[PDB]
Amino acid sequence: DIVLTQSPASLAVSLGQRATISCRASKSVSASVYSYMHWYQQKPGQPPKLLIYLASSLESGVPARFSGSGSGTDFTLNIHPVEEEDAATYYCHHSRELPPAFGGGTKLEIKRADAAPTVSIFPPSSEQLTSGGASVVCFLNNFYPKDINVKWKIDGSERQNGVLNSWTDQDSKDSTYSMSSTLTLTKDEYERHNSYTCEATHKTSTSPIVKSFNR
Amino acid sequence: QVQLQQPGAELVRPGASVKLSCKASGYSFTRFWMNWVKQRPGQGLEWIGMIHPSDSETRLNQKFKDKATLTVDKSSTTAYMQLSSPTSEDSAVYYCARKDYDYDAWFAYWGQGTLVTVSAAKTTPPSVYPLAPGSAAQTNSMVTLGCLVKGYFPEPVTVTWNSGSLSSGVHTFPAVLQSDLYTLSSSVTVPSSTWPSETVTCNVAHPASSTKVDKKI
Numbered sequence: 008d009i010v011l012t013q014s015p016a017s018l019a020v021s022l023g024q025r026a027t028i029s030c031r032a033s034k035s036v037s038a039s040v041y042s043y044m045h046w047y048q049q050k051p052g053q054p055p056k057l058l059i060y061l062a063s064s065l066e067s068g069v070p071a072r073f074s075g076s077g078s079g080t081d082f083t084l085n086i087h088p089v090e091e092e093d094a095a096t097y098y099c100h101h102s103r104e105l106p107p108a109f110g111g112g113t114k115l116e117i118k119r120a121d122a123a124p125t126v127s128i129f130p131p132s133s134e135q136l137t138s139g140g141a142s143v144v145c146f147l148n149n150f151y152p153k154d155i156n157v158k159w160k161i162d163g164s165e166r167q168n169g170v171l172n173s174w175t176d177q178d179s180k181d182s183t184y185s186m187s188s189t190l191t192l193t194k195d196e197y198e199r200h201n202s203y204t205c206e207a208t209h210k211t212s213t214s215p216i217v218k219s220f221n222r
Numbered sequence: 223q224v225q226l227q228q229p230g231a232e233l234v235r236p237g238a239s240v241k242l243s244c245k246a247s248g249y250s251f252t253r254f255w256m257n258w259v260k261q262r263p264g265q266g267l268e269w270i271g272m273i274h275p276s277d278s279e280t281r282l283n284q285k286f287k288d289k290a291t292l293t294v295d296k297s298s299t300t301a302y303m304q305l306s307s308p309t310s311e312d313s314a315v316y317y318c319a320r321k322d323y324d325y326d327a328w329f330a331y332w333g334q335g336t337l338v339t340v341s342a343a344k345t346t347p348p349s350v351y352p353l354a355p356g357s358a359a360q361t362n363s364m365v366t367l368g369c370l371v372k373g374y375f376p377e378p379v380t381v382t383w384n385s386g387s388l389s390s391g392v393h394t395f396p397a398v399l400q401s402d403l404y405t406l407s408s409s410v411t412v413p414s415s416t417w418p419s420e421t422v423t424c425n426v427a428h429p430a431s432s433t434k435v436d437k438k439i
Binding site: 041043044045047049054055056057060061096098100102105106107108109110111112125127128129130131132134135138142144146148171172173174175185186187189191220 | 353
């Protein structure tokens with residue numbers, strides 16, 4: 008059939024600039040001067056939505072900053088100017104042949120200045136200690152870029168076991184990143200230790216940010 | 223208003239068989255064709271199969287051939303898709319779309335989505351615990367609170383603050399698989415004036431187990 012390959016796989020464009028994403032088809036989808044293509048935008052946790060049909064046309068209700076062009080086997084998607092709400096995963100679809108297929112996908116992100124994370128660590132609840140478990144959870148919010156590291160230190164000793172890290176997608180309005188780290192340990196390990204330290208290593212800080220508490 | 227409804231999520235063991243429902247409304251069910259789309263996180267979107275509801279004629283992908291079976295109910299205006307022997311690669315979010323034909327055919331409307339997780343584990347109701355700092359150095363004018371949801375299968379789980387009263391400064395973190403059980407956390411950032419005056423509660427609802435847990439912070 009017709010295989011669609013989009014390049015690149017991920018793109019970061021600053022606000023006010025232009026974002027160009029190409030959809031390359033293995034075979035020509037153009038039939039009778041009218042090419043077969045559809046551009047889809049999909050946000051995380053939502054179904055995709057149509058944007059550009061026939062590669063030359065904008066759908067009613069879709070803002071005018073979204074546009075596309077190209078003929079034959081090479082199509083492009085041009086978004087200018089780029090806005091904070093434009094961050095999402097983009098797709099392309101060919102109706103020319105059967106079976107119809109979808110593109111490999113491209114994730115557009117907003118580029119801006121770097122930001123330092125806000126580190127807050129929460130001791131385990133008394134309800135969890137009743138069941139016999141304990142979880143020391145540490146929150147890191149509003150940091151850019153997404154490259155960051157979290158180090159757990161109990162009583163001055165680093166413990167990498169029992170750590171659950173979860174990263175989010177880029178915030179629409181803030182264009183920042185957020186993550187958490189959960190250190191799970193038994194109540195016996197909770198009563199036999201006092202100091203619980205959460206450290207954050209980010210490109211905006213030469214030294215790790217220390218946020219801790221005492222039992 | 224044309225709308226396509228689907229169940230929230232479905233749990234299945236490897237080698238079993240499930241039947242997914244796609245309910246069409248707002249337009250005649252027999253005048254359009256029903257298509258199915260597979261989305262695995264990080265893989266992107268994939269095409270499954272398309273069925274003509276009038277004659278129940280099916281067109282399936284070679285990858286999904288003999289894996290999927292399509293059938294429709296014209297009296298209930300609802301389309302069905304049967305999946306046989308799902309594997310670990312078959313765990314994904316499934317969609318049903320109405321294909322709108324004007325010359326080139328696009329997809330105008332989509333379903334709510336269904337997350338089918340392939341595992342041998344049994345549904346575990348969530349255990350929700352509040353997270354409060356209990357101490358601080360008074361170095362910040364903002365008060366951050368959190369909520370921990372652990373020991374639940376399968377995903378996802380809806381977590382709101384004060385039954386959705388706070389739509390700002392809230393962050394819902396995705397689940398993490400540990401020891402066959404999913405775990406997520408949540409956070410909310412309110413100013414130092416809101417914390418003593420307003421009560422912050424954690425509203426958690428698990429769609430798979432149909433359970434709701436409320437914990438005050």
